[PDB]
Design a protein around this ligand. Structure first.
Ligand SMILES: [Ca+2]
Length: 471
């Protein structure tokens, strides 16, 4: 006794991430209502009734999503506790698509059928069997790391002119061979206080370094695995999924801390993004390198924040404690390398360029007029904990001419194509020029300094610096 109105359960297990499940009927059961004849398939559907192949299943899904294949009906199926169940009316064949998982996972298509000839059995030459299928998905990821920084407890810190080395690794989506959207697309953009170096971009794949040519082609073993382009203060890099052989490339690049580096809480972040398809049988692979795609495309992301601080102090008369203008000070790192030169303002105050966590030294180069030179070195420790001052407040002026250095001062770093590098980040090239500080501008009169929270950005010396009046 067949009907029709015979029911059987079509079931999907291993549903993670809470996707939408849609069933598209691609095969109608044809009855005489008491005898089962065969399946009638939607126009454009092609499959092997003996055992449909992955190629065929994905192909059908592609057609459904373009509209080339019109299913006989579309069903929305609820989920719970990792499974979905649908009560089919009569022998019938469906493609299930799982889309929009909130954890970012991407799923393969599923073929489900209710059949009188055994679970899933499509050959038609009493009892209506259902079908249970285990859903299959992949969860991409992207992880960004930075080195070249100085650890301040759990904060990575840096200084003006430091070169920072970033690295990306990622886990690929798993796409079936016939998928129409195999987007594999990587982006980063550096915040404005870091100057991205596109020429530093490297790609390793299968333990081999890529050569990136002039037009952006990422070449390994005479194979183009992707194309890179410099965009704003960063890059877009679109890979060719099939060329990767399911092995993820590893991406590295550098940036150098510039004078716009933010001090304190906000820090200096990047934002690495990995775009892929979470509905790979819909649309087309995205590879436009001018502009990253909008989110059948979704993404994972990662960011590293790097911090800087600034050193401040006040210059006063040793007896009256009244503030002294125009005192010139050097600020040195722990090994006595000159970091910066500052001049005190009307209110006695000076502030350094951006520094990493660490110990520094403040030493006078020129007394204020009417005062004897203070020959003492003043030490100060800079870190998240000591940077409790918030100021309402530089762009240093360099020369490569040693004889134009203020106060006959030493070299503070290097210049290459307009960019400042610290001594410890001395870059390569035959046109790398010595950098000296040519002049110093005092801080604007009426700049305030208020004691405040950790990470405010400014480390103000505990005791003001005395000068002894000549008289
Ligand atoms: Ca369920």
């Amino acid at each position: 006794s067949l009907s029709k109105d015979d029911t059987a359960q079509l079931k999907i297990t291993n549903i993670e991430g809470g996707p939408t499940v849609t069933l598209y009927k691609i095969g109608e059961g044809v009855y005489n209502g008491d005898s089962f004849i065969n399946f009638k398939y939607a126009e454009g559907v092609s499959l092997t009734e003996t055992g449909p192949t992955s190629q065929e299943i994905t192909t059908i899904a592609n057609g459904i999503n373009t509209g080339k294949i019109k299913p006989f009906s579309t069903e929305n199926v609820s989920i719970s506790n990792g499974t979905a169940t649908y009560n089919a009316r009569g022998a019938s064949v469906y493609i299930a698509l799982l889309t929009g998982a909130t954890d970012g996972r991407t799923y393969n298509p599923i073929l489900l059928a209710a059949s009188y000839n055994g679970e899933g059995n499509l050959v038609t030459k009493n009892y209506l069997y259902g079908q249970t299928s285990v859903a299959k998905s992949s969860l991409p990821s992207i992880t960004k790391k930075v080195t070249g920084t100085i650890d301040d407890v759990n904060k990575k810190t840096t200084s003006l002119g430091s070169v920072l080395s970033y690295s990306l690794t990622f886990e690929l989506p798993s796409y079936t061979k016939e998928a129409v959207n195999k987007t594999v697309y990587v982006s980063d953009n550096m915040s404005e206080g870091l100057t991205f170096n596109f020429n530093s971009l490297t790609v390793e794949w299968k333990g081999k370094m890529a050569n990136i040519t002039e037009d952006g082609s990422v070449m390994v073993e005479n194979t183009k695995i992707g194309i890179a382009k410099e965009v704003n203060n960063g890059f877009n890099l679109s890979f060719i999924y099939d060329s990767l052989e399911s092995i993820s490339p590893n991406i590295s690049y550098k940036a150098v801390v510039n004078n716009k580096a933010i001090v304190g809480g906000e820090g200096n972040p990047n934002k690495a993004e990995f775009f892929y398809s979470n509905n790979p049988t819909k649309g087309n692979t995205y590879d436009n390198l001018d502009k990253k795609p909008d989110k059948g495309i979704t993404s994972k992301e990662d960011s590293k924040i790097v911090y800087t601080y600034q050193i401040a102090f006040r210059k006063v008369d040793s007896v009256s404690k009244t503030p002294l203008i125009g005192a010139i000070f050097g600020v040195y790192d722990t090994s006595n390398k000159l970091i910066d030169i500052v001049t005190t303002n009307k209110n006695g105050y000076a502030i350094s360029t951006q520094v990493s966590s660490g110990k520094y030294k403040i030493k006078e180069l020129k007394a204020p007029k009417g005062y004897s030179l203070n020959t003492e070195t003043y030490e100060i420790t800079a870190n998240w904990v000591t940077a409790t001052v918030k100021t309402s407040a530089k762009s240093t002026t360099y020369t490569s001419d040693k004889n134009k250095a203020t106060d006959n001062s030493e070299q503070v770093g290097w210049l290459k194509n307009g960019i400042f590098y610290s001594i410890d980040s001395r870059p390569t090239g035959n046109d790398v020029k010595e950098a000296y500080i040519e002049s110093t501008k005092a801080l604007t009169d009426g700049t305030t300094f208020s004691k405040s929270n950790e990470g405010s950005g400014t480390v103000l010396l505990e005791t003001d610096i005395p000068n002894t009046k000549l008289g």
